[PDB]
């Protein structure tokens, strides 16, 4: 009714506004329009067009699975951030709706979203430490205490999301970004998200996902523990032993055989409680974050350097 009227006032234009206005407009995304949420990205005469009001980094390099994430500059403000390009035809409303208006240290801030032609350009804080995925490739694999430290932070983000009945849907190293000193980790990429009451990465898929069963917040927990194994071992679960990986996840025992023997007992225990095949038996974000918290205390806290020495994968 009035929502109809607000939406009309937003269509056809790029404006500065609040998270709720971006959500409402987003819903119409199944021509240059959208909403910018920070003072640092500013429309000019109803517009925000690539290579006119904003420009991506000089020689076009990119991050993400599809090389779709870029460093960018507002031409007027000079402010630097990041953009994820999503194809309009494939844009999921939920990537913005389950995202806009959140505010947590453990979740990457949304800066706005603008439609231009066949593109939905989603803007966000540029996290300069890169992704946890890049770190793992750089370092070979992570020390136990660093792995726990980041797993806890990811879990705090999941706590925050789960309380709001948002499923992340693709929890993994590649989707955990780091500040420039490595001390702050945050969840990004809500391209797979779903609001509770296009699938994630196959290796990190929970059995109930793979089997087509009913899914809740607990899927994120399983994914996060697969990510933990990725951190410790320097490779995804199921890689070493296995054919289509989605068949083995359903039938086979959880990949707890991949917990390194070197890990401390409570680290091992925690990964096991997050890798229970049945969701009822699997730990919640709150439960697991607490365990992982003491797990990190049990190995003397965070001590190892963020970029220490290389360590060979398994």
Ligand X SMILES: C[C@@](O)(C#Cc1ccc2c(c1)N(c1nc(N)ncc1Cl)CC2)c1nccs1
Residues in binding site for ATP: 61-69, 84
The residue among 108 and 158 lying less far from ligand X, judged by its C-beta, is: 108
Q: How many CA atoms lie within 13 A of 81 on its CB side?
A: 25
Question: Is 170 among the catalytic positions?
Answer: yes
Residue 104: exposure state from Cβ atoms within 10 A (0-12, 13-18, ≥19): middle
295 touches ligand X (CB under 6 A):
no
259 touches ligand X (CB under 6 A):
no
User: What is the per-residue binding string for ligand X in 168-187, x denoting contact by CB under 6 A?
Assistant: ---------x----------
127 touches ligand X (CB under 6 A):
yes
SS3 of 264, please? coil
- Using the rule CB under 6 A, which residue among 6, 126, 245, 268 binds ligand X? 126
Closest-CA residue to 287 (of 159, 197, 153)? 159
The residue among 69 and 217 lying less far from ligand X, judged by its C-beta, is: 69
- Minimum distance between the CB of residue 43 and ligand X, rounded to whole angstroms? 19
Scan residues 189-228 and list those touching ligand X (CB under 6 A): 189-191
**Phi, psi at 125, each rounded to 5°:** -60, 140
Tokens read off for 100: 């806009």
d(C-alpha 7, C-alpha 20), whole Å: 11
Q: Which residue in the block uniquely carries the two structure tokens 């995202």?
A: 99
Options 74, 145, 170, 189, the catalytic residue? 170
Q: Judge contact between 79 and 125, C-beta under 8 A.
A: no
d(C-alpha 132, C-alpha 130), whole Å: 7
122 touches ligand X (CB under 6 A):
yes
d(C-alpha 80, C-alpha 28), whole Å: 28
- Minimum distance between the CB of residue 87 and ligand X, rounded to whole angstroms? 13
Size of the site for ligand X (CB under 6 A): 21
d(C-alpha 67, C-alpha 86), whole Å: 11
63 touches ligand X (CB under 6 A):
yes
Scan residues 65-94 and list those touching ligand X (CB under 6 A): 69, 82, 84
99 touches ligand X (CB under 6 A):
yes
Catalytic residues: 170
In the complex, the residues that contact ligand X under the rule CB under 6 A are 63-64, 69, 82, 84, 95, 99, 108, 110, 122, 124-127, 130-131, 177, 188-191
């Amino acid at each position: 009714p009035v929502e109809e009227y607000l939406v009309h006032a937003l269509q056809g234009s790029v404006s500065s506004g609040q998270a709720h206005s971006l959500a409402s407009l987003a819903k119409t995304w199944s021509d240059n329009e959208g909403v910018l949420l920070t003072e640092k990205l500013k429309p000019v005469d109803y517009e925000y067009r690539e290579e006119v009001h904003w420009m991506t980094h000089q020689p076009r390099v990119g991050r993400g699975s599809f090389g779709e994430v870029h460093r960018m500059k507002d031409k007027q403000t000079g402010f630097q951030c990041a953009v994820k390009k999503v194809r309009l035809e494939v844009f999921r409303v939920e990537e913005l709706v389950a995202c806009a208006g959140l505010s947590s240290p453990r979740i990457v801030p949304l800066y706005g979203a603008v439609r231009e032609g066949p593109w939905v350009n989603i803007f966000m804080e540029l996290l300069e430490g890169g992704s946890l995925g890049q770190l793992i490739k750089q370092m070979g694999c992570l020390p136990e205490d660093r792995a726990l430290y980041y797993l806890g932070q990811a879990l705090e983000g999941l706590e925050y999301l789960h309380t709001r009945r948002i499923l992340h849907g693709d929890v993994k190293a590649d989707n955990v970004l780091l500040s420039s000193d490595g001390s702050r980790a945050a969840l990004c990429d809500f391209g797979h998200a779903l609001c509770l009451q296009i699938p994630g990465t196959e290796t990190h898929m929970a059995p109930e996902v793979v089997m087509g069963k009913p899914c809740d917040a607990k899927v994120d927990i399983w994914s996060s523990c697969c990510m933990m194994l990725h951190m410790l071992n320097g490779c995804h679960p199921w890689t070493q032993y296995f054919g289509p990986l989605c068949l083995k996840i359903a039938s086979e025992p959880p990949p707890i055989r991949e917990i390194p023997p070197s890990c401390a007992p409570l680290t091992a225990q925690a990964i096991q409680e997050g890798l229970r095949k049945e969701p009822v038996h699997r730990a919640s974000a709150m439960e697991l974050r607490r365990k992982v918290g003491k797990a990190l205390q049990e190995v003397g806290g965070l001590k190892s350097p963020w970029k220490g020495e290389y360590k060979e994968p398994r």
